[PDB]
Design an enzyme around this catalytic site. Structure first.
Site, PDB file in Angstrom:
ATOM      1  N   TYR A  86      56.608 -26.865  -4.783  1.00 57.48           N
ATOM      2  CA  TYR A  86      56.507 -26.316  -6.139  1.00 57.48           C
ATOM      3  C   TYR A  86      55.293 -25.391  -6.211  1.00 57.48           C
ATOM      4  CZ  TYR A  86      54.964 -26.421 -11.091  1.00 57.48           C
ATOM      5  OH  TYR A  86      54.513 -26.033 -12.342  1.00 57.48           O
ATOM      6  N   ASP A 130      65.113 -10.481   3.702  1.00 58.07           N
ATOM      7  CA  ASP A 130      65.423 -10.583   2.270  1.00 58.07           C
ATOM      8  C   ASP A 130      64.206 -10.790   1.376  1.00 58.07           C
ATOM      9  OD1 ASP A 130      67.143 -11.335  -0.182  1.00 58.07           O
ATOM     10  OD2 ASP A 130      68.588 -10.901   1.427  1.00 58.07           O
TER      11      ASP A 130
HETATM   12  C1  LIG Z   1      61.879 -20.127 -10.847  1.00 59.66           C
HETATM   13  C2  LIG Z   1      61.036 -21.031 -10.015  1.00 59.66           C
HETATM   14  C3  LIG Z   1      61.401 -21.349  -8.757  1.00 59.66           C
HETATM   15  N1  LIG Z   1      60.473 -22.106  -7.993  1.00 59.66           N
HETATM   16  C4  LIG Z   1      60.477 -22.513  -6.651  1.00 59.66           C
HETATM   17  C5  LIG Z   1      61.569 -22.210  -5.744  1.00 59.66           C
HETATM   18  C6  LIG Z   1      62.285 -23.024  -4.903  1.00 59.66           C
HETATM   19  N2  LIG Z   1      63.242 -22.314  -4.284  1.00 59.66           N
HETATM   20  N3  LIG Z   1      63.078 -21.071  -4.723  1.00 59.66           N
HETATM   21  C7  LIG Z   1      63.968 -20.021  -4.299  1.00 59.66           C
HETATM   22  C8  LIG Z   1      65.215 -20.171  -5.143  1.00 59.66           C
HETATM   23  O1  LIG Z   1      65.260 -20.953  -6.077  1.00 59.66           O
HETATM   24  N4  LIG Z   1      66.235 -19.338  -4.727  1.00 59.66           N
HETATM   25  C9  LIG Z   1      67.604 -19.436  -5.104  1.00 59.66           C
HETATM   26  C10 LIG Z   1      68.085 -20.376  -6.081  1.00 59.66           C
HETATM   27  C11 LIG Z   1      69.451 -20.386  -6.407  1.00 59.66           C
HETATM   28  N5  LIG Z   1      70.233 -19.501  -5.797  1.00 59.66           N
HETATM   29  C12 LIG Z   1      69.853 -18.594  -4.865  1.00 59.66           C
HETATM   30  C13 LIG Z   1      68.556 -18.523  -4.492  1.00 59.66           C
HETATM   31  F1  LIG Z   1      68.292 -17.561  -3.548  1.00 59.66           F
HETATM   32  C14 LIG Z   1      62.092 -20.928  -5.602  1.00 59.66           C
HETATM   33  C15 LIG Z   1      59.333 -23.236  -6.443  1.00 59.66           C
HETATM   34  N6  LIG Z   1      58.614 -23.101  -7.565  1.00 59.66           N
HETATM   35  C16 LIG Z   1      59.268 -22.451  -8.499  1.00 59.66           C
HETATM   36  C17 LIG Z   1      58.933 -22.035  -9.812  1.00 59.66           C
HETATM   37  N7  LIG Z   1      57.706 -22.502 -10.289  1.00 59.66           N
HETATM   38  C18 LIG Z   1      57.331 -22.263 -11.544  1.00 59.66           C
HETATM   39  C19 LIG Z   1      56.113 -22.663 -12.023  1.00 59.66           C
HETATM   40  C20 LIG Z   1      56.028 -22.231 -13.384  1.00 59.66           C
HETATM   41  C21 LIG Z   1      54.838 -22.439 -14.202  1.00 59.66           C
HETATM   42  N8  LIG Z   1      54.518 -21.196 -14.959  1.00 59.66           N
HETATM   43  C22 LIG Z   1      53.658 -20.229 -14.217  1.00 59.66           C
HETATM   44  C23 LIG Z   1      53.588 -18.882 -14.972  1.00 59.66           C
HETATM   45  C24 LIG Z   1      53.289 -19.090 -16.482  1.00 59.66           C
HETATM   46  C25 LIG Z   1      54.114 -20.223 -17.182  1.00 59.66           C
HETATM   47  C26 LIG Z   1      55.616 -20.024 -17.546  1.00 59.66           C
HETATM   48  C27 LIG Z   1      53.950 -21.465 -16.314  1.00 59.66           C
HETATM   49  N9  LIG Z   1      57.051 -21.533 -13.913  1.00 59.66           N
HETATM   50  S1  LIG Z   1      58.225 -21.301 -12.786  1.00 59.66           S
HETATM   51  N10 LIG Z   1      59.803 -21.326 -10.530  1.00 59.66           N
END
Ligand SMILES: Cc1cn2c(-c3cnn(CC(=O)Nc4cc[nH+]cc4F)c3)c[nH+]c2c(Nc2cc(C[N@@H+]3CCC[C@@H](C)C3)ns2)n1
Length: 249
Positions: A86, A130
């Site tokens: 994460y 990619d």
């Molecule tokens: C979207 C997401 C994904 N994450 C991953 C992660 C895991 N796998 N992947 C690749 C993938 O999912 N690919 C994929 C998925 C489906 N189909 C095709 C594909 F290719 C990304 C790890 N961590 C995160 C993450 N952390 C966050 C923290 C906060 C906290 N936030 C910080 C900014 C301000 C405020 C809003 C607070 N927001 S989002 N967010």
């Protein structure tokens, strides 16, 4: 080894092309993580399956500070689950939407972190192919973390890939130049309103710089955005570039 029962699901972090990724906590350890919940249907109906087993076996054995670690996986009747690291500060894609563009110091450091991660990858003969803001995430320290190594927009793909020719590790060098341009300008160099307008812009390597782009930035991107892969530098030169050394941290 793992099962849905072993985790407590949190808010959805983001929806992707095959499913969504949720915040989660393993019950016994209390370990915070990312749960990529992908549908068995959406994946298998588009013949993607082979790339997910690849992402599994690649991302699990891939250990580097700037590479989103994969701890494990499982698959229930309807869905498929990848247990991932994460990134507390979210995606670079979202950061760029907020800031619009990044300064020379934030860009250089991200290229450096990408370069070191890719340097490590090119050892195990791992080529990402990619890289794009959506697959670039940010750890507790605002450090860059690459996700999804199992491998659609043309933006970051070089001529070789799009024209159906032979490609090397040099594909990721080009993507680094599309990213370096994007991080500074706020849009990728070949961004167009159609697949066919972009395909032409990439093929003929037609891109321009706004006035504000530094000579050292103009240099690096121009070195990286070459049609002939051989002419692109290699990561050790990118890391040693005067613009990067001057502006990185
Ligand atoms: C979207 C997401 C994904 N994450 C991953 C992660 C895991 N796998 N992947 C690749 C993938 O999912 N690919 C994929 C998925 C489906 N189909 C095709 C594909 F290719 C990304 C790890 N961590 C995160 C993450 N952390 C966050 C923290 C906060 C906290 N936030 C910080 C900014 C301000 C405020 C809003 C607070 N927001 S989002 N967010």
């Amino acid at each position: 080894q793992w099962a849905l029962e072993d985790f407590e699901i949190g808010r959805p972090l983001g929806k992707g092309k095959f499913g969504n990724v949720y915040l989660a906590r393993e019950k016994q350890s209390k370990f915070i993580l990312a749960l990529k919940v992908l549908f068995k249907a959406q994946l298998e109906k588009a013949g993607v399956e082979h790339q997910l087993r690849r992402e599994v076996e690649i991302q699990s054995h891939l250990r580097h500070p700037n590479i989103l670690r994969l701890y494990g996986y499982f698959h229930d009747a309807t869905r498929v689950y990848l247990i991932l690291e994460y990134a507390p500060l979210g995606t670079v894609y979202r950061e760029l939407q907020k800031l619009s563009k990044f300064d020379e110091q934030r860009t250089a450091t991200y290229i450096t972190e990408l370069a070191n991660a890719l340097s490590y990858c090119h050892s195990k003969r791992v080529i990402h192919r990619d890289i794009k803001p959506e697959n670039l995430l940010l750890g507790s320290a605002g450090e860059l973390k690459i996700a999804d190594f199992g491998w659609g927009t043309l933006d970051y793909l070089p001529p070789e890939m799009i024209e159906g020719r032979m490609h090397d590790e040099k594909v990721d060098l080009w993507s680094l130049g599309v990213l370096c341009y994007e991080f500074l300008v706020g849009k990728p160099p070949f961004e167009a309103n159609t697949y066919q307008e972009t395909y032409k812009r990439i093929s003929r390597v037609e891109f321009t710089f706004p006035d504000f782009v530094t000579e050292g930035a103009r240099d690096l991107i121009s070195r990286l955005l070459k049609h002939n892969p051989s002419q692109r530098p290699m990561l050790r030169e990118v890391l040693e570039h005067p613009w990067i050394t001057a502006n990185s941290s």
